[PDB]
RNA sequence: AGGAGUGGAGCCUGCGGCUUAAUUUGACUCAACACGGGAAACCUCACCCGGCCCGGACACGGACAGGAUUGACAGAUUGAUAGCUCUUUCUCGAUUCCGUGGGUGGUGGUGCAUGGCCGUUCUUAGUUGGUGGAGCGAUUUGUCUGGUUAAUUCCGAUAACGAACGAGACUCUGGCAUGCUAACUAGUUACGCGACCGGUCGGCGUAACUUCUUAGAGGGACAAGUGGCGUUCAGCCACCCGAGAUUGAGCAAUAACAGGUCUGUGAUGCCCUUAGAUGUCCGGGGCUGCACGCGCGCUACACUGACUGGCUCAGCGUGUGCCUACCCUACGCCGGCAGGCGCGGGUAACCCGUUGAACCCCAUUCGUGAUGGGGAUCGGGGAUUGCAAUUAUUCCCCAUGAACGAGGAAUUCCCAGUAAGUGCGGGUCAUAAGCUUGCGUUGAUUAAGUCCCUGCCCUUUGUACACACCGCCCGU
């Protein structure tokens, strides 16, 4: 039959969440950043945003086909109806999930914590970010856990602008002695129409138009046209 | 080396502080 | 956190070990000296229990083992 | 596990047919939805698939109470030998393109 | 200043103790104790007594065409239609079995090994560079004598000037719009047709349209106007006009806690266990056990009330499910009742529903007493949900009818549609709210202040502290 609108919306949200979790677990190593689900008559297009699209596709597309089939089998879409693209992020430096994955696989590669964090920070700043903050917590040195914070630029924390001016990601790193937690926050620059950042300005920012230089008429001149 | 500055800044007073300071100069 | 100390309830229940029988010679009986095999056991009268399967013969009753169909001697 | 030969055979034909296999992590459901009408319990699917993974023939992923298994090249060769399929028979994932 | 209290009673709940086969345990000041969404019949489930299963991958050797798998009967279960074991003898056919490695998973330990999340310091008003000034230097000024603010909010002093995070701004929400957009899943007027005595029609139907209802865009409030107080500044007080002259939430810095959580997780490192298992099913116990102590609460002690009829008003919202069994209900009939049986609508501004809520309002009987207050306890019957209701799930009926007459020391929460009365929804939910989270409904007394108590901030000052007073330290 059919279900209520409330249940339908909750259900498609649940589907999106599970799909994103599975795609994360599958393509974290390939710079996975997110999934977009587009429903069109008799078709469902799944766009996977990743930094390394060729690794996501695999050789001759094999990997992507596998993924499609797996989705087809899991969520019970009719055979041949679901399909999966794969695109690249516009700016990797401004995606906190991508930077968190980069830091994760840097730490998994034996790189020292401070070197990796400072490199990620500098790459984010060089990408045009207004500011960023990277926190790594856990057994960094010895048996006692500690936290380690790296900040640069401007970073807001309160109010509604935090929901569209700063992008946040939290990730786990499985090391020999235990889990390291990494948190990456990027404060996006104000972008008027062009997606490097939000279109709306910060609510407390007031810009005053510079008055043009006029010359006061000394005498009444009448111009006939 | 930047790695020396990092390892020193992590523990400015530690088992490896003197060696890293000597390396920095 | 203490040990079970379950020696009160049994001394370890033995598991079943199937007795090894050599072959199925006792089922068929050619030995007619004229190549006439006689079946020394009944066969099952179930659909999936055709000429291949047989039925056991206890001190009473006939038992299949495949479909668990029983015919008491009486 | 101890399972009938036909069960393992059917599991293998499915896996070779699309090169992937998903299954809910639930040992108590009586029929695998894709392997229904063949009376293959889901537990049999999970245990056979874990056997193949241990032997290195599939790659496994888990998320939200579901296993996903992808056939590997060594798994493709092993399944071709096991089911005796002609060298020209290939799983659906290798086709297209 | 006061309001409602509670601490006293009975009951319901959580905690300790006691008890026990077991009464699983986490968390003891705020920052544990109707908390773990923790309302446990089974399940849940960790705990106790019994009993099946392997769901012990894989690699290496044994055994092997018979490796090994089921199983009807009688015994037996020291519970079972458990082939669990015996007895017995068929069955299945390389999937196993027997060893060695090796794995796997545990609501096992460790929250003092961790991540994440949350709580707390602290919803306080705090925090930090750059350049300049002062110091040999750690460092300091900026970040302040003072007025002002809810605010490190501003004004103003000024070796500082410019800034950043936090506060504010912001988002959601409450009030206003006869102005705009526009509606048979909302209506209202008007007109016809009917029913009763021009009137009453949630009676029927179709034009107008958008006041009422929905929900979009925009508007609207800024201490803006007036008068006082102020350095005549920042602002404060009062008044007019006005829908409104302080609606309520959400988010929230630097830094820290050995705060809580390994019992939320296919989050986790190390240990422990791993086949008569701490894995997992399956019976039965427990989690409630009761000399006692302690929290949150519910119902009261009546007449500003109980009883019995009569009358008449809400809002928030939730409804038929992946697995997944289990929805909200109108109307008819049967039965005091709780219920039962037929019939329909609804996946919902469409049906329940016009949500005919309670208090309150009106009338009645009682008549100052443990009384017709109050409903603990207990007996006997009847139903419902469930696989099982006993230790009594819940509900109904008839009986029984305890303490309690306003509560000692001591304490909590509160400034307006607020406290408090009063119902209603959501969660939990097969069955179920004395809990919690929301919603309306009736609707106040008092205050417009202060550091007295309690904290918590500063500032100056002292220190022999710096693991920082739970410090340091002296002598027999
Ligand atoms: Mg704010
Ligand atoms: Mg300086
Ligand atoms: Mg100087
Ligand atoms: Mg200072
Ligand atoms: Mg005081
Ligand atoms: Mg000292
Ligand atoms: Zn038979």
TrEMBL record, chain B:
Residues 1-25 form the BetaCoV Nsp1 C-terminal domain. It is found in: Host cytoplasm, Host perinuclear region; Host endoplasmic reticulum-Golgi intermediate compartment; Host membrane. Belongs to the coronaviruses polyprotein 1ab family. Plays a role in the initial induction of autophagosomes from host endoplasmic reticulum. Later, limits the expansion of these phagosomes that are no longer able to deliver viral components to lysosomes. Interacts with nsp7 and nsp8 to form the replication-transcription complex (RTC): nsp12, nsp7, two subunits of nsp8, and up to two subunits of nsp13. Interacts with nsp9. This is ORF1ab polyprotein. It comes from Middle East respiratory syndrome-related coronavirus. The chain holds residues 167 to 191 of 6114 of the full protein.
